[PDB]
Amino acid sequence: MANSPVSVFGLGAMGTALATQFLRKGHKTTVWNRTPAKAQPLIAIGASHAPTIDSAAAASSLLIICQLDKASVMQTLQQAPTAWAAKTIVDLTNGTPAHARETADWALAHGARYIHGGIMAVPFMIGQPDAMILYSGPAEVFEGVKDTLSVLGTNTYVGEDVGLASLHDLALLSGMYGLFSGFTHAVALVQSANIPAAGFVATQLIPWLTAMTQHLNLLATQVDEKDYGDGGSSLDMQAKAAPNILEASQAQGVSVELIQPIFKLIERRVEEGKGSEGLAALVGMIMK
Amino acid sequence: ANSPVSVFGLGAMGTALATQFLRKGHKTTVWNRTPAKAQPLIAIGASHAPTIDSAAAASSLLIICQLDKASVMQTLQQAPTAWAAKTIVDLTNGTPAHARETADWALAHGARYIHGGIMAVPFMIGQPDAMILYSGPAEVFEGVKDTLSVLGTNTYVGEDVGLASLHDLALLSGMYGLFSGFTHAVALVQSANIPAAGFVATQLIPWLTAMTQHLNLLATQVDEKDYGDGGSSLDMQAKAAPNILEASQAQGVSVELIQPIFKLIERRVEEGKGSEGLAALVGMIMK
Ligand SMILES: NC(=O)C1=CN([C@@H]2O[C@H](COP(=O)(O)OP(=O)(O)OC[C@H]3O[C@@H](n4cnc5c(N)ncnc54)[C@H](OP(=O)(O)O)[C@@H]3O)[C@@H](O)[C@H]2O)C=CC1
Ligand SMILES: NC(=O)C1=CN([C@@H]2O[C@H](COP(=O)(O)OP(=O)(O)OC[C@H]3O[C@@H](n4cnc5c(N)ncnc54)[C@H](OP(=O)(O)O)[C@@H]3O)[C@@H](O)[C@H]2O)C=CC1
């Protein structure tokens, strides 16, 4: 292995995928896992198995941590508190913005540099260009390791505050859960009349959602300008579709629990006298 | 010089329908409760019917594009003998029940009846990306589908006259989920003073585009009643949820729009089915 050394801490599904990709691109790859047996498949394709946290940290300057949660990351760090000096830690362990900031503070106090990353991909997609990985933390630190990290996917630096990658990650997941709420309600409705989901989804729902997804750029601009529009696809107009959806759902025996919240928000805005505004107005309503 | 059509209702959508029929050479008779709305159509060749009865008499294909089912019934009931041996194509939005009720009246008055759901705004009428759902007797639809094809892409969804409306409302339900997601995502980034436009254009839209394609695999699982074991399990989703909730709380963002799916996921995990995937949620809201 002729390329710059990397150590990977955590050899679950994701850490295994990261280590595999580093090895495939010729990096000297040292691996560590709390349960040491998980290293064996990687040893078989050229990984070096570190017997301790301390020796994994010593083997490389770039130390990737991909464990379960922030508590587990802290447990790893605290096991060898002098091992991190002059190292760059890239923490790809999911958590809150606060978790990233707290971990960074510890790392900085122990002589390490620290970047947080959020992997927007499943393990199988690591190493593909479609795998987006968000990163945040000091720009100069990121600059030093971004070429090595680019083996994993498309690097997307989102700023200096170390908690920002996690915020972007969780924002994207929130978007996905809305999409899945819509899928669930739509498919329940057609399934309630014995319509197969696959044909409906492939030929009607996906094309419709694709068209409506493009509308989001205009909404985003309105959010930024704090100018929610007048007439058109107003909230007054949306509030006219809602009773049909609710009544049809009730008649088909489909619960409205997943869609009722946005309908209640729309109705609140109408009742405040702002029915002429559009959907961009809803963002400020859920903010503090 | 082409086959006659009558359009009842000259709002934004009815005007667009009449305009497209005229552009494709159909003799187009128009009627509206407020007669002034006919004047622009007269100027491009429409015949203005003085009564509902005379609009019905002018054509075999009678398109009704009004506000709601009550308004459709008001039009029909004004001239109860006018509809015999005519094909009514009702493009007025409502519930499946509304379409069935209207069809029952039409059939009792000697008419044939198709319901359609326009998944498009008026200016898109006549374009291939305008999908129009239709339901009702297949043999009736056969007789009018070539004329109707000038309006958009015909999508026949079956015999039960309420099915076009069910498909339409299902699609809208999907959209409202998408908008719930947009709202929460953008609130979160805005709470940290991140501009929405850059985030949406370069991160959220590409991500949602990729997740939208994943819906085909979920749909297959729903149909097979086989919700998977491991992978992107509900157990895995239930680990992201507390991070989203805690970060939202810290940023002062209400979780009212996403809490319901999190509660459904948690219920399924607690029933011992955490190894199943998101396709399991469809059956949970059915009953
Ligand atoms: N899988 C996925 O699709 C995605 C995962 N992620 C994130 O990547 C990270 C890793 O996920 P994934 O690999 O799939 O999860 P796995 O459950 O497969 O692996 C979790 C890893 O964390 C380790 N770990 C748990 N507790 C501790 C501890 N106290 N001290 C040290 N190590 C510990 C495990 O060690 P041991 O083997 O000894 O149990 C294992 O290496 C998580 O933050 C996850 O949210 C990000 C995007 C997608
Ligand atoms: N426009 C859109 O973006 C979309 C509309 N649709 C559906 O198409 C239909 C028409 O929409 P659109 O034209 O845009 O709406 P408008 O408000 O522009 O038009 C409503 C029409 O209904 C008529 N109407 C209202 N009440 C009655 C009544 N009691 N008797 C007779 N006619 C009546 C109005 O007549 P008058 O001029 O006298 O007021 C007008 O012609 C609705 O079902 C709508 O949901 C479907 C897809 C999207």
Numbering used by the authors:
A (entry chain B): 1 to 288
B (entry chain A): 2 to 288
Question: What did the paper state?
Answer:
The NADPH-dependent imine reductase from Ajellomyces dermatitidis (AdRedAm) catalyzes the reductive amination of certain ketones with amine donors supplied in an equimolar ratio. The two AdRedAm monomers associate to form a dimer in which reciprocal domain sharing results in the formation of a large active-site cleft between the N-terminal domain of one monomer and the C-terminal domain of its partner. One of them, AdRedAm from Ajellomyces dermatitidis, has been reported to be more stable than AspRedAm and thus perhaps more suitable for process applications.
The second form, which belongs to space group C21 and was refined to 1.73 Å resolution, has nine molecules (four and a half dimers) in the asymmetric unit, each complexed with NADP+. Variations were also readily observed amongst the four dimers present in the structure from data set 2, which was obtained from crystals that grew in space group C21 and featured nine molecules in the asymmetric unit. In this structure, once again, the vast majority of backbone atoms could be modelled in subunits A–I from, in some cases, the leucine and phenylalanine residues in the purification tag at positions −5 and −4 through to Lys288. The exception was chain H, in which electron density for Gly229–Gly232 was poor and could not be modelled. In the case of data set 2, all monomers featured electron density in the omit maps that could be modelled as the cofactor NADP+. In the most divergent examples, monomers E and I exhibited a hinge movement between the N-terminal and C-terminal domains of 14.8° as calculated using the DynDom server, with the hinge movement centred around the pendant aspartate residue Asp169.
